[PDB]
């Protein structure tokens, strides 16, 4: 017997203590070593209720990653309202490592193993573990990178699918590689992200087909973001410590559902020195990019969508429109922590 | 429970655009709740237009608005702005900004409201009213006909505010001309008709028009 | 997608009386329904969030109940501050609204008619006003007669908000017509119908 509860969790990792890479440095003093042999116990005839949208684990990871960033990143200048902080901005080594979140004595973590579990509701195949799987704290918008993949079918997650204010996490059951590069020696800020168009459009098709299931059967349509800061309107992320912003217009081409649609899709990307800080209020300025080839090959494992609002014409419209979203980084963590909840014994 | 603060009423020709501002927080003081914009046309049901996330400018516009609406916030993220382009007459409405209370979960439970911003879309030009008397025929009624003004509103006082006990100032009505009219009538005993002066004071600020009409038998 | 059928379209009730408006949904929506109160000239005001949760600063008589597909708002003992329109909200979808006011003893309108000023006639226009003062219910029917010839489509009327003290409405109707058209007739009348009237009342004047 147990009950739902929230407790201070601790992180564990396989960080290397001698590394200067900032995630390793952080995790070295902020986490313990991974359990060399973690146990997982399956609960024969148990059925438990999860709610990935109300999971304090997400709050803790957010606290941790914010903390990792605030002490790892070194902007030449931080601006926050009426505060201007100048400082040294040496380039850093930057590459996210897997963090596991673990419960203290007296508490256990329940894990849902239902293949098509969407994040909330009853779960039949439950088990208990001492830690989550290893989760890379990747901060990105529009696309979820280097995450884990859905087990069987593509899964749609929302706190409320019919609530247009709710972000929609799409969980892929097959990853699509995205290969971003700022070539060596054009403007040093100019980069591009290449994506196999064939694989991508097959997936993006299967996605629309899954969204169809949640909206009677209205034709699904994608569009570029209707607005917002660049971190939102572009696919935003950090690579080797540089802030990329890739234009994803070409990624959500409805026509590709015939000629030319296959083949490699190149996305125009920009490396920015002046960015908006996701951690909260303010701008940061970094030095210009390092020299040489700058390259990040990532796995697309999820997409963050926003659905277009408006039900006024009781009958109204025959199609639904979705736009790449994100910007609330807690959603990145929910993307991975969805199958876990803390219970007290 | 605090009221948000919206910009003043606006008048626009069709085809033009307007921008309504909504101050929803002090610059100087849980993801923030989005700012929602709605409008209500005269004698109509409230219509949701959009939300805007002040944290990153993320937005969602009602689809039927056809990209005509744009919402943003200032650098301090204390004020939201709604821009409506290609104005048509049926964009005439009171525009509201609304927001959920910060210690609540639903994004849609609009606890906070701006006082609303009247937006009038018309091709009529600004115009002061003419004020004609409504001469009284135990108790007699008398009033003023406030005729052909644009835009709303006009305010009506009797005897420079002095008396209000028996005053019925009716809502303005829009004439086919595109101009407004309203009446303001006053109940009074008959005896008084020959002892006390009754002046209806009419002010139409938009045309900077003041008038003092004495209503006699 | 979702459709909120609210009802009744309108209703009246005596002070201290129980009033219940209901909302129905084309689909199950759990508790994701909010209720509002909008008094004439003011912004809406949130009464009940998430179907059942009452908000701070909202009188006890106000109650929200319901779940799934059936919801309702209730006012234990109806007070005069509660005269307004009430609508439900399901995200960005709003109910049709229910106008509610105070039910009092049917009351007849005190009627008055006004010829057009001579100053207005010089303008080449003529406005004939017919005032109805302090009656209930709001319903009524003013129809203009020019020499006993009912007029229609040339009249515009305007009602006030239910007075707070006595709980009555008052109505102003304006019959508009050109100067030249006005000088063609003599008898000008307001034909009035209402519950408070045993017979349709006429109030007229002869031009000049
Ligand atoms: C997920 O599954 C549960 C099963 O109870 C269902 O109630 C819920 O609506 C689903 N969520 C979404 C948004 O698909
Ligand atoms: C992914 O999901 C879709 C259904 O959403 C399914 O048809 C497809 O076969 C799945 N792909 C893999 C590799 O499991
Ligand atoms: C990624 O793209 C770069 C630049 O085009 C190329 O040099 C590299 O081979 C690519 N890597 C992979 C894994 O395809
Ligand atoms: C792209 O993806 C398709 C589908 O998996 C694959 O056949 C092909 O080898 C990939 N590379 C190119 C150049 O299209
Ligand atoms: C709806 O869409 C699905 C998927 O395209 C299709 O198989 C089915 O015929 C349609 N019927 C309903 C109401 O699900
Ligand atoms: C991305 O590229 C498209 C096509 O060049 C352009 O129309 C659009 O404005 C761009 N989006 C952003 C966020 O700059
Ligand atoms: C979208 O579809 C068109 C039509 O087939 C295609 O030619 C074009 O390359 C695509 N554009 C984008 C935004 O990828
Ligand atoms: C994703 O993981 C790969 C392999 O570890 C890494 O090279 C790449 O930089 C990662 N992408 C991001 C955005 O962190
Ligand atoms: C939103 O989701 C909850 C469960 O998470 C459900 O009870 C409710 O019916 C949903 N609301 C709508 C509007 O469908």
Identify each DSSP E strand in C55-168 by its residue range.
62-67, 70-75, 84-90, 93-94, 98-102, 110-114, 125-135, 141-146, 150-151, 155-159
Residues ≥6 apart with Cβ < 8 Å to C101 = C12, C83, C138, C162, C167
DSSP, res B105: S
Best CA proximity match to A188, nearest among A293, A286, A62: A293
Q: Report the C-alpha gap between A85 and C185 in whole angstroms.
A: 84
The SS3 assignment for C92 reads: coil
CA dihedral A273, A276, A282, A283 (to 10 degrees): 10
Place of tokens 């239902």: A114
Give buried/exposed letters for B143-158 (b at 16+ CB in 10 A, else e).
bbbbbbbbbbbbebbb
- Answer yes or no: are the C-beta atoms of C204 and C190 closer than 8 Å: yes
The SS3 assignment for B194 reads: helix
**DSSP assignment of chain C, as one string?**
---EEEE-SEEEE-TT--EEEEEEESS--TT--EEEEE-TTS--EEEEETTTEEPTT--TTEEEEEETTEEEEEESS--GGG-EEEEEEETTEE---EEEEE----B--EEEEEPPPHHHHHTTEEEEEEEEEEEBSS--EEEEEESS-EE-SSEEEEE-PPPSSS--EEEEEEEEEEHHHHTT--EEEEEEE-TT-SS-EEEEEE--
- Answer yes or no: are the C-beta atoms of A147 and A303 closer than 8 Å: no
What is the bridge-based pairing of β-strands A31-33 and A10-13?
parallel
| Interhelix angle A56-72/A22-30, nearest 10 degrees | 120
Best CA proximity match to C174, nearest among C99, C120, C134: C120
Other beta carbons less than 10 A from residue A181's beta carbon: 16
Q: Report the C-alpha gap between A142 and A120 in whole angstroms.
A: 22
Q: Report the C-alpha gap between A109 and A131 in whole angstroms.
A: 7
Other beta carbons less than 10 A from residue C22's beta carbon: 18
The SS3 assignment for B134 reads: strand
Place of tokens 């017979």: C199
Distance of CA A134 to the CA centre of its chain: 14
Other beta carbons less than 10 A from residue C2's beta carbon: 15
Place of tokens 């003041």: B210
- Torsion-angle region of residue A326: left (phi > 0), alpha (psi -120 to 50) or beta? left
Domain boundaries, chain A: 1-345
Q: Report the C-alpha gap between C18 and C15 in whole angstroms.
A: 9
Question: Which residues, in sequence order, are bridge partners of residue C22?
Answer: C7, C72
| Interhelix angle A330-337/A56-72, nearest 10 degrees | 130
The residue whose CB lies within 8 Å of the most ligand 5 atoms, and thus the one to mutate among A215, A217, A218, is A217
Torsion sign (Cα): A326, A331, A333, A339: negative
- Answer yes or no: are the C-beta atoms of A324 and A302 closer than 8 Å: no
The SS3 assignment for B91 reads: helix
- Answer yes or no: are the C-beta atoms of B39 and B96 closer than 8 Å: yes
- Answer yes or no: are the C-beta atoms of C126 and C37 closer than 8 Å: no
Q: C104-208: what fold?
A: Immunoglobulin-like (2.60.40)
Determine phi and psi for A29, rounding to 5 degrees.
Answer: -95, -15
Q: Report the C-alpha gap between B48 and A153 in whole angstroms.
A: 35
Closest residue in B to A275 (Cα–Cα): B56
Q: C1-103: what fold?
A: Immunoglobulin-like (2.60.40)
How far is the alpha carbon of C101 from chain A, nearest alpha carbon, in Å?
A: 27
Question: Which residues, in sequence order, are bridge partners of residue C70?
Answer: C24, C67
| Tokens describing residue A248 | 């994803």
Q: Report the C-alpha gap between A212 and A97 in whole angstroms.
A: 36
**What does each C-alpha distance from A223 to A133, A248, C202 come to in angstroms?**
34, 10, 64
Other beta carbons less than 10 A from residue A56's beta carbon: 16
Experimental method: X-ray
Distance of CA C28 to the CA centre of its chain: 33
Residues ≥6 apart with Cβ < 8 Å to B53 = A228, A327, B32, B34, B35, B59
**Where chain A is broken, by preceding residue (C–N > 2.5 Å)?**
185, 257
- Answer yes or no: are the C-beta atoms of A138 and A96 closer than 8 Å: yes
Residues ≥6 apart with Cβ < 8 Å to C132 = C109, C110, C111, C140, C142, C170, C171, C172, C173, C192
- Chain A segment 132-191 residues within 8 A of B by beta carbon are 163-165
Q: Report the C-alpha gap between A344 and C32 in whole angstroms.
A: 30
What is the bridge-based pairing of β-strands A319-324 and A219-222?
parallel
Q: How many Cα atoms sit within 13 Å of A31 on the Cβ side?
A: 29
How far is the alpha carbon of B140 from chain C, nearest alpha carbon, in Å?
A: 8
Q: Report the C-alpha gap between B184 and C39 in whole angstroms.
A: 22
Q: Report the C-alpha gap between B133 and B146 in whole angstroms.
A: 9
3-class secondary structure per residue, chain A: CCEECCCCCEEEECCCCCCCCHHHHHHHHHEEECCCCCCEEECCCCCEEEECCCCHHHHHHHHHHHHHHHHHCCCCEEEECCEEEECCCCCCCCCCCCEEEECCCCEEEEEECCCCCCCEEEECCEEEECECCCECCCCCCCEEECCCCCCCCCEEECCCCCCCCCCEEEEEEEEEEEEEEECCCCCCCEEEEEEEHHHHHHHHHHHHHHHHCCCCCCEEEECCCCCCCHHHHCEEEEECCEEEEECCHHHHCCCCCCCCCCCEEEEEEEEECEEECCCCCCEEECCCCCCCCEEEEEEEEEEEEEECCCCCCCCCCCEEEEEECCCCCHHHHHHHHCCEEEEEC
- Answer yes or no: are the C-beta atoms of C78 and C13 closer than 8 Å: yes
| Tokens describing residue C186 | 């003599």
- Answer yes or no: are the C-beta atoms of A197 and A104 closer than 8 Å: no
Query: A interface mutation test: which of B26, B55, B58 has the most A CBs within 10 A?
Result: B58
**CA geometry: angle C180, C186, C190, nearest 5 deg:** 105
DSSP, res B150: B
CB contact (8 A) between residue C1 and residue A162: yes
Nearest CB to B64; choose among A163, A232, A310: A310
Q: Please, where in chain C does CATH 2.60.40.10 lie?
A: 1-103, 104-208
| Tokens describing residue B87 | 């104005």
| Tokens describing residue A229 | 């800061």
Resolution in angstroms for this experimental structure? 2.3
CA of A313 to the centre of ligand 1 (A): 26
How far is the alpha carbon of C161 from chain A, nearest alpha carbon, in Å?
A: 28
Q: Which ligand sits closest to the CA of A180? A: 3
| Tokens describing residue B192 | 């008084």
| Tokens describing residue A335 | 């993307």
Integer-rounded Cα Rg, in Å, for chain C is 22
Q: Report the C-alpha gap between A61 and A8 in whole angstroms.
A: 11
Question: Which residues, in sequence order, are bridge partners of residue C202?
Answer: C191
Q: Report the C-alpha gap between C192 and C189 in whole angstroms.
A: 9
Contacts of B182 in chain C (CB under 8 A): 158
Closest residue in B to A82 (Cα–Cα): B76
What is the bridge-based pairing of β-strands A99-102 and A10-13?
antiparallel
CA of A233 to the centre of ligand 6 (A): 9
DSSP, res C118: H
Q: Report the C-alpha gap between A181 and A192 in whole angstroms.
A: 6
CA dihedral A98, A104, A110, A116 (to 10 degrees): -20
Chains that touch A (3 or more CB pairs under 8 A): B, C
Other beta carbons less than 10 A from residue A287's beta carbon: 15
The SS3 assignment for B65 reads: helix
**What does each C-alpha distance from A24 to A30, A96, C52 come to in angstroms?**
10, 8, 49
- Answer yes or no: are the C-beta atoms of B76 and B59 closer than 8 Å: no
What is the bridge-based pairing of β-strands C19-25 and C70-75?
antiparallel
Q: Which domains does chain B have, with CATH numbers?
A: 1-123 (2.60.40.10), 124-217 (2.60.40.10)
Other beta carbons less than 10 A from residue A302's beta carbon: 28
Interface of A with C (CB under 8 A): 160, 162-165, 215-216, 309-312, 314
Pocket of ligand 9 (CB under 6 A): A 120, 160, 162; C 28-30, 32
Determine phi and psi for A100, rounding to 5 degrees.
Answer: -105, 140
Q: Report the C-alpha gap between B215 and B198 in whole angstroms.
A: 6
Place of tokens 């239910």: C162
Best CA proximity match to A112, nearest among A315, A344, A341: A341
Q: Report the C-alpha gap between C140 and C156 in whole angstroms.
A: 14
Q: How many Cα atoms sit within 13 Å of A289 on the Cβ side?
A: 24
Q: Report the C-alpha gap between C193 and C195 in whole angstroms.
A: 7
- Answer yes or no: are the C-beta atoms of A231 and A140 closer than 8 Å: no
How many residues appear in chain A?
A: 345
| Tokens describing residue B91 | 């964009």
Residues ≥6 apart with Cβ < 8 Å to C162 = C83, C101, C102, C138, C168, C169
Q: What is the largest CA-CA distance in chain B?
A: 69
Q: Report the C-alpha gap between A99 and A13 in whole angstroms.
A: 5
Other beta carbons less than 10 A from residue B117's beta carbon: 22
- Answer yes or no: are the C-beta atoms of A264 and A194 closer than 8 Å: yes
Q: Report the C-alpha gap between B190 and B179 in whole angstroms.
A: 34
| Tokens describing residue A2 | 């147990």
**What does each C-alpha distance from A342 to A50, A59, A116, A132, C23 come to in angstroms?**
10, 13, 21, 11, 38
| Tokens describing residue B100 | 């959920």
Best CA proximity match to A334, nearest among A74, A79, A50: A50
CB contact (8 A) between residue B108 and residue A163: yes
| Tokens describing residue A317 | 């419209």
Question: Which residues, in sequence order, are bridge partners of residue A86?
Answer: A77
Question: What CATH number has the domain spanning A1-345?
Answer: 2.170.40.20
């Amino acid at each position: 017997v147990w009950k739902d509860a929230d407790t201070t969790l601790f992180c564990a990792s396989d960080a290397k203590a001698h590394e200067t890479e900032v995630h390793n440095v952080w995790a070295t003093h902020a986490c313990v070593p991974t359990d060399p042999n973690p146990q997982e116990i399956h609960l024969e005839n148990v059925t438990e209720n999860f709610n990935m949208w109300k999971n304090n684990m997400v709050e803790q990871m957010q606290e941790d990653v914010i903390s990792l960033w605030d002490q790892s990143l070194q902007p030449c200048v931080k601006l926050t309202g009426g505060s201007v902080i100048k400082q040294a901005c040496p380039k850093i080594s930057f590459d996210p490592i897997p963090i596991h979140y673990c419960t203290p004595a007296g508490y256990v973590i329940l894990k849902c193993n239902d293949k098509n579990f969407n994040g909330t509701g009853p779960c039949k195949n439950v088990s208990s573990v001492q830690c989550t799987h290893g989760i890379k704290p990747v901060v990105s918008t529009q696309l979820l990178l280097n995450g884990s993949l859905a087990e069987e079918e593509i899964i749609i997650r929302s706190e409320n699918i019919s609530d247009n204010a709710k972000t929609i996490i799409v969980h892929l059951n097959k990853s699509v590689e995205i290969n971003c590069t700022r070539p060596s020696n054009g403007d040093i800020r100019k980069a591009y992200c290449e994506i196999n168009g064939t694989k991508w459009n097959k997936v993006l098709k299967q996605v629309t087909e899954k969204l169809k299931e949640h909206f009677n059967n209205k034709t699904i349509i994608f569009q570029p973001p209707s607005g917002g800061d660049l971190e939102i309107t572009m696919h935003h992320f950090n690579c080797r410590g540089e802030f990329f912003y890739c234009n994803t217009t070409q990624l959500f081409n409805n026509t590709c559902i015939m000629k030319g649609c296959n083949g490699t899709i190149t996305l125009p990307c920009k490396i920015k020195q002046i960015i908006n800080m996701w951690q909260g209020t303010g701008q940061a300025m970094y030095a210009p990019p390092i020299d040489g080839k700058i390259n990040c090959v990532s796995n697309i494992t999820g997409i963050l969508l926003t659905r277009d609002g408006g039900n006024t014409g009781n009958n109204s419209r025959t199609n639904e429109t979705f736009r790449p979203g994100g910007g609330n980084i807690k959603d990145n963590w929910r993307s991975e922590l969805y199958k876990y909840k803390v219970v007290q014994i | 429970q605090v009221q948000l603060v919206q910009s003043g009423a606006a008048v626009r020709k069709p085809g033009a655009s307007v921008t309504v501002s909504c101050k929803f927080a002090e610059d100087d003081d849980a993801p923030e709740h989005f700012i929602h914009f709605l409008r209500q046309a005269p004698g109509q049901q409230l219509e949701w237009l959009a939300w805007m996330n002040p944290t990153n400018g993320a937005v969602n516009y009602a689809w039927y608005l056809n990209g005509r609406v744009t919402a943003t916030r200032d650098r301090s993220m204390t004020t939201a702005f709604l821009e409506v382009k290609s104005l048509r007459s049926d964009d005439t409405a009171v525009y509201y900004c609304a927001r959920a209370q910060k210690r609540g979960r639903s994004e849609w439970a609009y606890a906070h409201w701006g006082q609303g911003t009247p937006v009038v879309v018309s091709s009529a030009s600004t115009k002061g009213p003419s004020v004609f008397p409504l001469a009284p025929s135990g108790t007699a009624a008398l009033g003023c006909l406030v005729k052909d003004y644009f835009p709303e509103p006009v305010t009506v006082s009797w005897n420079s505010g002095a008396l209000t006990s028996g005053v019925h100032t009716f809502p303005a009505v829009l004439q086919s001309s595109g101009l407004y009219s309203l009446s303001s009538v006053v109940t009074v005993p008959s005896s008084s008709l020959g002892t006390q002066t009754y002046i209806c004071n009419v002010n139409h600020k938009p045309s900077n028009t003041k008038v003092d009409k004495k209503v006699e038998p | 997608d979702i459709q909120m059928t609210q009802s009744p379209s309108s209703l009246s009730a005596s002070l201290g009386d129980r009033v219940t408006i209901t909302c129905q949904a084309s689909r199950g929506i759990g508790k994701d329904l909010n209720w509002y109160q909008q008094k004439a000239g003011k912004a809406p005001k949130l009464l009940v969030s998430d179907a059942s949760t009452l908000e701070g600063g909202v009188p006890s008589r106000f109650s929200g109940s319901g779940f799934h597909q059936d919801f309702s708002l209730t006012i234990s003992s109806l007070q005069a501050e509660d005269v307004a329109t009430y609508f439900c909200q399901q995200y960005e979808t709003f109910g049709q609204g229910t106008k509610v006011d105070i039910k009092r003893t049917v009351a007849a309108p005190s009627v008055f008619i006004f010829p057009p000023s001579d100053e207005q006639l010089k303008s080449g226009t003529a406005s004939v006003v017919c005032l109805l003062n302090n009656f209930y219910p709001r319903e009524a029917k003013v129809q203009w007669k020019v020499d006993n010839a009912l007029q229609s489509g040339n009249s515009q009327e305007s009602v006030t908000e239910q007075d707070s003290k006595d709980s009555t409405y008052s109505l102003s109707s304006t019959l508009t017509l050109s100067k030249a058209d006005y000088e063609k007739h003599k008898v000008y009348a307001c034909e009035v119908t209402h519950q408070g009237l045993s017979s349709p009342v006429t109030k007229s004047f002869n031009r000049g």
